[PDB]
């Protein structure tokens, strides 16, 4: 079944990604090219995995959706050095995403 | 062609095998890393070590070990800690230091 909440999370997921021009966070960090990634990051996350989760009914409340967004950001800050395109992008995403998530949660908790 | 040169050849290939990503196989590319020489006084890599070896410039084991240690220390110096490069050098310090320990025992008999 397709609910209003799922529809809202779809919209929210797309809003979080508009803030990401380089598609830095669109797909999993490629482990072939980044072979040390799993030595430092326990639970990788990215926007495509989130969409898979969303469409498979794994985000039945707002907290679990926000948790995975927050993992995208915190994993990136953790893995990358500060003086990088990637770390700077995650700082910006924290800022811009925090705001999108604030208004979406307000809408969700009325359902 | 001495037993010593043959030993260093074998040792060098063993060190290279520890670097699965071939990060240290060739000099750091100055066209991609233009400020490298402003930080690093004496660049080193496994191909340069092979050139030195084949041109008889490793008179003794200490000189060879010194160059291996440079590959590692240069990389820790130049790069930020949270990089593939730095992390790889930290692993190479351990795994390569061990290769050198066993090879030195053999060298010192010659």
């Amino acid at each position: 079944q397709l609910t209003p909440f799922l529809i809202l999370l779809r919209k929210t997921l797309e809003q979080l990604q508009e803030k990401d021009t380089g598609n830095i966070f669109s797909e999993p960090v490629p482990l072939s090219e980044v072979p040390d990634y799993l030595d430092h990051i326990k639970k990788p996350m990215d926007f495509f995995t989130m969409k898979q989760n969303l469409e498979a009914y794994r985000y039945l409340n707002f907290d679990d959706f926000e948790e995975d967004f927050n993992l995208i950001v915190s994993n990136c800050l953790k893995y990358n050095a500060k003086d990088t395109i990637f770390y700077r992008a995650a700082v910006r995403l924290r800022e811009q995403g925090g705001a999108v998530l604030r208004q979406a949660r307000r809408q969700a908790e009325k359902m | 062609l001495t037993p010593f040169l043959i030993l260093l050849r074998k040792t060098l290939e063993q060190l290279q095998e520890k670097d699965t990503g071939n990060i240290f196989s060739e000099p750091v590319p100055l066209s991609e890393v233009p400020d490298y020489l402003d930080h690093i006084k004496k660049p080193m890599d496994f191909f340069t070590m092979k050139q030195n070896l084949e041109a008889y410039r490793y008179l003794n084991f200490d000189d060879f070990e010194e160059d291996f240690n440079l590959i590692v220390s240069n990389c820790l110096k130049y790069n930020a800690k949270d990089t593939i490069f730095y992390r790889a050098a930290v692993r190479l310090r351990e795994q390569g230091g061990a290769v050198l320990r066993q090879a030195r025992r053999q060298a010192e008999k010659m």
Partner: peptide, 10 residues
């Protein structure tokens, strides 16, 4: 450290 080599992994 210098400017860095950039990139993500290799």
């Amino acid at each position: 450290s210098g400017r860095g080599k950039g990139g993500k992994g290799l």
